[PDB]
Amino acid sequence: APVRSLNCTLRDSQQKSLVMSGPYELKALHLQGQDMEQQVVWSMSFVQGEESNDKIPVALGLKEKNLYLSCVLKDDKPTLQLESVDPKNYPKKKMEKRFVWNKIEINNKLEFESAQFPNWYISTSQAENMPVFLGGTKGGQDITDWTMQFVSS
Numbered sequence: 001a002p003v004r005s006l007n008c009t010l011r012d013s014q015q016k017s018l019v020m021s022g023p024y025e026l027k028a029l030h031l032q033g034q035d036m037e038q039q040v041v042w043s044m045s046f047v048q049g050e051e052s053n054d055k056i057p058v059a060l061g062l063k064e065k066n067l068y069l070s071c072v073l074k075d076d077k078p079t080l081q082l083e084s085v086d087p088k089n090y091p092k093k094k095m096e097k098r099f100v101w102n103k104i105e106i107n108n109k110l111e112f113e114s115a116q117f118p119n120w121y122i123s124t125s126q127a128e129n130m131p132v133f134l135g136g137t138k139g140g141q142d143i144t145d146w147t148m149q150f151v152s153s
Contacts, residue, residue, distance in 0.1 A: 003093045005045040007063055007153040012124045013109060013145035018132065020062075024082040026132040028124040041151060045091045049100055049115060056103045057115060059095045066090060071098045071116045071134065078117040080134040109145040122146075 011017055012028060017039040021027040031039060041063040049057030061068040062082075068090070070083040083099075100115035101122070112122040114134060121144040123135035135142050 003045050003047065003091050005043050005091065007151045008042050008044055008148045009039055009151060010042065010146050010148050012143045013147070014124070014126070014143055016124060016128075016143075020082075021131065024067075026082065027129050028132055029129045043091070044103075044148075045095070047091075047095045047100060048093050049102075054105045057100050058103050059091055059099050060101060060112075061091065068099050069101065069122070071114045071120070078114060078120045078134050078136070080122065080132065106145065109147060111144055112146070 009017070015030065016028040017031040017036070018026050018028055019031070019038045020040055026040065043061050043063045045059040045061070047057055047059050051057060059068060066085050066087040067082050068085055070081050072079055072081060097116050102113040102115055104111040104113060114120045117134070117136075119138070120134050120136045121138070122132065123142045123144045124130070124132055125142060135144065138144060
């Protein structure tokens with residue numbers, strides 16, 4: 001097949017799950033039991049780019065939906081957003097740079113660094129039910145570590 005993908009869910013190091021807040025926004029919160037069902041399921045694609053043993057470029061989109069995690073400048077600052085794309089042309093092996101994320105395997109966790117903006121990571125707040133955002137600080141007050149779970153697809 002052209003581009004390879006696998007389905008998964010993501011949780012931050014504080015065990016918070018992701019749910020689609022608005023139409024183009026994600027929020028992180030502690031979920032368990034029935035609520036679990038609300039969590040977003042992703043289709044992670046292995047696209048083209050600078051690769052390494054612990055740095056794999058990927059694209060992140062919602063499963064079965066033409067929505068992808070993108071990186072753009074807003075108020076002179078790298079920002080995260082969910083972007084709509086033509087459902088016929090995606091996903092592809094050569095994704096536009098703003099859609100590429102470097103999946104980094106640290107200790108036993110994962111970090112998602114923007115390919116566009118070096119050292120900017122998909123982060124979550126310690127707080128409950130807050131938006132997921134792009135952060136440029138490491139080891140600070142915000143969470144930048146994740147674990148992924150593979151789903152039967």
